[PDB]
PDB file of C-alpha atoms in Angstrom:
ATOM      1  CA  UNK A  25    -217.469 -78.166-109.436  1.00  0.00           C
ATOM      2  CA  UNK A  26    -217.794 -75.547-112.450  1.00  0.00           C
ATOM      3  CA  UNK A  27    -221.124 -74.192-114.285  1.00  0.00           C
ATOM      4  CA  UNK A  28    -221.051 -75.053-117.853  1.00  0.00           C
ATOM      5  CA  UNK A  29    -223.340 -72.176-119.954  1.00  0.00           C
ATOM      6  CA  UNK A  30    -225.490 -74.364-122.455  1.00  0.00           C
ATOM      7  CA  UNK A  31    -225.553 -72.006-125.498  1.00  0.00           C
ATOM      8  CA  UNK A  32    -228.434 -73.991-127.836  1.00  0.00           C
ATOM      9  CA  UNK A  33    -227.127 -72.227-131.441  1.00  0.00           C
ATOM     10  CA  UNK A  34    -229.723 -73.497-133.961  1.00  0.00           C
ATOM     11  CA  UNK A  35    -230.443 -73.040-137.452  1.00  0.00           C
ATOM     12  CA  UNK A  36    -234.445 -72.306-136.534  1.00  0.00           C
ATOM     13  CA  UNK A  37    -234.028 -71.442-132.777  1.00  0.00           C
ATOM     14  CA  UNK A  38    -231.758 -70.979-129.728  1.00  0.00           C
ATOM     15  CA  UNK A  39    -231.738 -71.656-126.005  1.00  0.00           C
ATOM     16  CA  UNK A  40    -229.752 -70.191-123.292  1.00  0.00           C
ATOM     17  CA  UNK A  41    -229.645 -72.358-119.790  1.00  0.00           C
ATOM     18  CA  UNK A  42    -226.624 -72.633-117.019  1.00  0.00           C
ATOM     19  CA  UNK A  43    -225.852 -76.184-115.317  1.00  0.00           C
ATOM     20  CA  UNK A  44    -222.951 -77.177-113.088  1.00  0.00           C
ATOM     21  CA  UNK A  45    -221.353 -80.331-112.748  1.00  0.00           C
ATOM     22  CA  UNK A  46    -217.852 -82.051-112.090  1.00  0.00           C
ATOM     23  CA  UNK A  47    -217.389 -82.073-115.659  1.00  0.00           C
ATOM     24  CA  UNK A  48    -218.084 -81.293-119.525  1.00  0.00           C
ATOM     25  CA  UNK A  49    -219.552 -85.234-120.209  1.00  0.00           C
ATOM     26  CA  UNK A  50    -221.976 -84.470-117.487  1.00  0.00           C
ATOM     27  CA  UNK A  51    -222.917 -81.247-118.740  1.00  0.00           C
ATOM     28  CA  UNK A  52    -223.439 -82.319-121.989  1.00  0.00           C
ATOM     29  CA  UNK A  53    -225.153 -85.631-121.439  1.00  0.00           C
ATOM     30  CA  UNK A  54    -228.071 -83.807-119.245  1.00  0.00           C
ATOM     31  CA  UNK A  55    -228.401 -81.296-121.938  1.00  0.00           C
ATOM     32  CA  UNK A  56    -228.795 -83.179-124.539  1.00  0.00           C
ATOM     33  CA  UNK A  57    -232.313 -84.237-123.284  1.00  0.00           C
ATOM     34  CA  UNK A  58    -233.618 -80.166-123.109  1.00  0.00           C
ATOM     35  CA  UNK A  59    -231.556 -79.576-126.809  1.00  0.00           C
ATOM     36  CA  UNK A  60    -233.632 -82.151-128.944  1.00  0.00           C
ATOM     37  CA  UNK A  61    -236.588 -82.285-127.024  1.00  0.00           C
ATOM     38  CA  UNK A  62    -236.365 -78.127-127.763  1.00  0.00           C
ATOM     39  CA  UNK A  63    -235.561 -79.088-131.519  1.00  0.00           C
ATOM     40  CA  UNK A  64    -231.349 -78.630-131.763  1.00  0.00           C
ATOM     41  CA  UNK A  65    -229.084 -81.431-132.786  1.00  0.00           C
ATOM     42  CA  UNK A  66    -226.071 -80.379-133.468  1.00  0.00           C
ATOM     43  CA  UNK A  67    -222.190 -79.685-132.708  1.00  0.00           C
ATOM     44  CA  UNK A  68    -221.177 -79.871-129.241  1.00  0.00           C
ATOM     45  CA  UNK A  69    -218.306 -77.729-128.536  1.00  0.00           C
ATOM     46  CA  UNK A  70    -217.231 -76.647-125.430  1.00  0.00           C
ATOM     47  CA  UNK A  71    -214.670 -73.807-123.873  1.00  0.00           C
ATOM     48  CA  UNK A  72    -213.570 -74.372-120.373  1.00  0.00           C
ATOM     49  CA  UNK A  73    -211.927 -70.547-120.407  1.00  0.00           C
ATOM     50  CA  UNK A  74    -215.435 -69.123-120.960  1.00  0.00           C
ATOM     51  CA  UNK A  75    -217.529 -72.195-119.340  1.00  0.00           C
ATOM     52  CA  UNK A  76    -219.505 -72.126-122.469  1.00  0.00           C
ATOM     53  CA  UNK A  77    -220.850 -75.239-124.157  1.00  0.00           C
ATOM     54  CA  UNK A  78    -222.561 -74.480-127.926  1.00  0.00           C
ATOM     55  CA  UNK A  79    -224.400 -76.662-129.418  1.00  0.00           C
ATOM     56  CA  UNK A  80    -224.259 -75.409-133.264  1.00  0.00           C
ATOM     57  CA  UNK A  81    -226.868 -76.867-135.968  1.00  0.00           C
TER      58      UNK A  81
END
């Protein structure tokens, strides 16, 4: 598997959290519960060089 870094990038607040998974969909899908329960909806963009996944509002 890989660990995707959740980078919550928000126009109010942010969120840093680390989750691994066989891939980005699953990484993204679990997240998204924590990101708009915490108050982010935005762009999901992710880097598989870095393992970074940034959600940007």
């Amino acid at each position: 598997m890989g660990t995707y870094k959740l980078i919550l990038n928000g126009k109010t607040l942010k969120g840093e959290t680390t989750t691994e998974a066989v891939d980005a969909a699953t990484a993204e899908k679990v997240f998204k519960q924590y990101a708009n329960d915490n108050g982010v909806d935005g762009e999901w963009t992710y880097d598989d060089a870095t393992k970074t996944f940034t959600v940007t509002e």
